[PDB]
Design a protein around this ligand. Structure first.
Ligand code: HEM
Ligand SMILES: *[C@@H]1O[C@H](CO)[C@@H](O[C@@H]2O[C@H](CO)[C@@H](O)[C@H](O)[C@H]2NC(C)=O)[C@H](O)[C@H]1NC(C)=O
Ligand SMILES: *[C@H]1O[C@H](CO)[C@@H](O)[C@H](O)[C@@H]1O
Ligand SMILES: [Ca+2]
Ligand SMILES: [Ca+2]
Length: 336
């Protein structure tokens, strides 16, 4: 409809500024449209920006947080002191500069960079992108980000307050398909959470269900559990959620279909993206977000393990027929 200066066809002139933000992020922040540490850090940031939203605090006479409001950037001095916000300041500063240079709100930028980053990762769905969130924010209250040592009850209660059902918690955790740790165990920096940290696929759900046999580092870090093979890190929250009766059937249903996983994640991310906002007051610029390269690989149980190594935790559904591989066990390289 609208033609931006660049030749760029879009739905609304409010989308035109985002083509320049796209180019900048793809060249610079993403270092040539790659799916590496910048994407992974941005996914932590989108979650930790949005989840600072608590109707229970509002109901108890207190500021509950503004949700997807960019507060993690605007008020980084306060929020990057939270336990869950370590290892993010360098990324936050990069985003701060992009936001100021292009004159876009910090809340919108985080959501945009999320959709753009996802688009660089094979197999990703096309995330929605809406523009118009006010740049104004107050600091998030403390203690709103679920931690990897939290019980399943605590995680579901916190996520629940923010607005997510147990299914949607599982759906949002598909981001751990593009993931490593740096801050839990300093001896195995960027140890992946799944065997394909640069492919948005079901491997995370499969591999967290394997029997824990392996200590990847010389000692355990915070909230670390045994993993199924060298190089892979397993955090306690993921281990527990995979196995808990409240989340295990959804977890298991993610294992065989990249396509259903992507749909569910897209829907949950759309919901998360507007905590603290009315989506109907925003402008849809989803057309700025390109599709990702498709992922042609099939789900697999790695390394000669079989379904007998899966701790099947959904008591009503058989484990899906998933291909196995040759041994021996893999050793995961650090995520790039
Ligand atoms: C039950 C809730 C969740 C908990 C307890 C949790 C916990 C963690 C922790 C402890 C790390 C490791 C950070 C480090 O040491 O470097 C991690 C990494 C990561 N998380 Fe989560 N997370 C959760 C949900 C999510 C959600 C909803 C998203 C985003 C949609 C997300 C995206 C990621 C990504 C992409 C990484 C990898 C970062 C990297 O490779 O640098 N997480 N998460
Ligand atoms: C969004 O609000 C933040 C906070 O007021 C603004 O960030 C400041 O921007 C000025 C001017 O560019 C910089 O000198 C400060 O370093 C920034 N402070 C912080 C904490 O980042 C930002 O400019 C506002 N963005 C828009 C589009 O208005
Ligand atoms: C096996 O090999 C990988 C590197 O190829 C390591 O990342 C892992 O910790 C294990 O030594
Ligand atoms: Ca926030
Ligand atoms: Ca993966």
């Amino acid at each position: 409809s609208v033609t931006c200066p660049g030749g760029q066809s879009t739905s609304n002139s409010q989308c035109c500024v985002w083509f320049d933000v796209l180019d900048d992020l793809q060249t610079n922040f993403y270092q040539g449209s790659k799916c590496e540490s910048p994407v992974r850090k941005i996914l932590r940031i989108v979650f930790h920006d949005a989840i600072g939203f608590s109707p229970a605090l509002t109901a108890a006479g207190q500021f509950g947080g503004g949700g997807a409001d960019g507060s993690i950037i605007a008020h980084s001095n306060i929020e990057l002191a939270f336990p869950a916000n370590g290892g993010l300041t360098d990324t936050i500063e990069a985003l701060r500069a992009v936001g100021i240079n292009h004159g876009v709100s910090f809340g919108d930028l985080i959501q945009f960079a999320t959709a753009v980053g996802m688009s660089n990762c094979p197999g990703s769905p096309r995330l929605e992108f809406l523009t118009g969130r006010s740049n104004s924010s107050q600091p998030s209250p403390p203690s709103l980000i679920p931690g990897p040592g939290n019980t399943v009850t605590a995680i579901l209660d916190r996520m629940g307050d923010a607005g997510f059902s147990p299914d949607e918690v599982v759906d949002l955790l598909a981001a751990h398909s593009l993931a490593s740790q740096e801050g839990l165990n300093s001896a195995i920096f960027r140890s992946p959470l799944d065997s394909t940290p640069q492919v948005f696929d079901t491997q995370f759900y499969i591999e967290t269900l394997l029997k824990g046999t392996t200590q990847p580092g010389p000692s355990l870090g915070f909230a670390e559990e045994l993993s199924p093979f060298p190089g892979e890190f397993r955090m306690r929250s993921d281990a527990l959620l995979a196995r808990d009766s409240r989340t295990a059937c959804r977890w298991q249903s993610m294992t065989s279909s990249n396509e259903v996983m992507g749909q569910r994640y897209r829907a949950a991310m759309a919901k998360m993206s507007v905590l603290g906002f009315d989506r109907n007051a925003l402008t849809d610029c989803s057309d700025v977000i390109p599709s990702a390269v498709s992922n042609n690989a099939a789900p697999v149980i790695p390394g000669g393990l079989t379904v007998d190594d899966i701790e099947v935790s959904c008591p009503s559904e058989p484990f899906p027929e998933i291909a196995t591989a040759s041994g021996p066990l893999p050793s995961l390289a650090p995520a790039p």
